[PDB]
Subunit: 101 residues, 6 copies
């Protein structure tokens, strides 16, 4: 009937100089319609614009962000989409630095 | 004394007739170990909370069954020790009883 | 360039009369440098002092606390460290009773 | 261009009576790029599964007195924010709160 | 019917060497019965036991703690009571040092 | 003996085309020393840099941000300082648009 609530508990792992593994939990409210997938966005320091990380909807609760530039800091957020619309983005993750560890 | 509520109640494997719930233990056990958990659900179109499990669930997960296809459900979980039962966790849902994804 | 933010969602499992397994998620902000490891602290009821549990940094997101006294209640908190410094401790977990 | 704002936060109550309650909240942390025009207050009674609009016109303030409560009943409350782009998700739910004198 | 939920958003102001002004918001859930009042407790560092500050229930949403010792650090928590019982305490405030601004 | 915790519940009111009134609550933990004051920072969209708004520490729990440009979006955060050091900034407030209500 309506858009779902935001995904919750966005977290990270496997941070490298060029990628990072994001993980989250599903919305607490689906808005009355099943979740079709998720939209991952990232924002780099030095730019005020949020970029889409996945082209097609991600049906998983995890996603590997790629294309990171070494030494840069990045913010991350993830939204959920159903037939009714797209949720507000989760709470922002980051700044996380693109370094090997 | 009674423990604090369970935290971070989440879901997975939503079907037309069931859903897998998962949570984390209380941050405070009130001075006595947790004996188990009490799972409750509430359907839309009805104002009463129903007990899902008969005996206490000692695990941190539980499969709710007996859902009606297409209906929306709320969920909450409490923790019990020798002293009493905690307040319920944060409410999960509305979640629609449909085969997800 | 600066200290990271606290670890988040500190939780517990596998509580025994002498040990407990702690688990957490990494800081939301690393302060510009990778996380080197974590510092686990505990505080017993009947004492107002926080104690370090691990000597060397824990690079993992989990750690088994040992040496607990039967029947006692304990508080727990974990911090993250990078080359710049140590974060504020996470939200306090506990009191958790040391019983099987 | 713009988008809906984030939900109002910290919805709380005061002056609970047999027939009314004073609701209070804080503005969204994100306005979506356009000023907040006002707020939409909703309530849900126990014994009914439907959310009801309490105010007809938008409330521009950060407070609003809900009236028409039935003595002894329990009520849930939530508030949303609206700008030119749309209406936010409702805040976290307040209640059940019983309409009774101390 | 049942005990209320904990008071929320416990905060402070007007910290002195002998007192502090506490303020909070009412429970999100009253358990089906009005809140009769609140119970303020404090715990000093160097002592492991929580002490009751007020004898009679406080019907207001604020209360001035007195009798603090200069230089000492204190923890604070507040509970709500209705005809059914007393809630879990709010989130703990402090350590706050008993010193003049 | 150590820095305080971040200020909490940073909120806004009286948004205009050139100013906004910020308000917050004191740290939950003062680190064992009184709070000397607060440091207010803002960041404009289209720029990745946080700017200090106040020169001298603000002892109050509120502050009027000025110098905003009409139509621009701004982020805000506030830190607390004692004799031991400066806290991590509070949770970020914004984006909030500089426009007359």
């Amino acid at each position: 009937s309506e858009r779902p609530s935001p995904p919750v508990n966005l977290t990270s792992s496997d941070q490298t100089q060029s990628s990072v593994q994001l993980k989250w939990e599903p919305p607490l409210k689906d808005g009355g319609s099943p979740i079709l997938g998720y939209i991952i966005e990232r924002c780099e320091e030095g730019k005020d614009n949020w970029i889409h990380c996945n082209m097609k909807l991600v049906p998983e609760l995890t996603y590997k962000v790629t294309g990171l530039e070494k030494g840069n800091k990045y913010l991350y957020r993830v939204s959920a989409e159903n037939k009714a619309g797209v949720s507000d983005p989760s709470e922002i993750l980051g700044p996380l630095t693109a370094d090997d560890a």
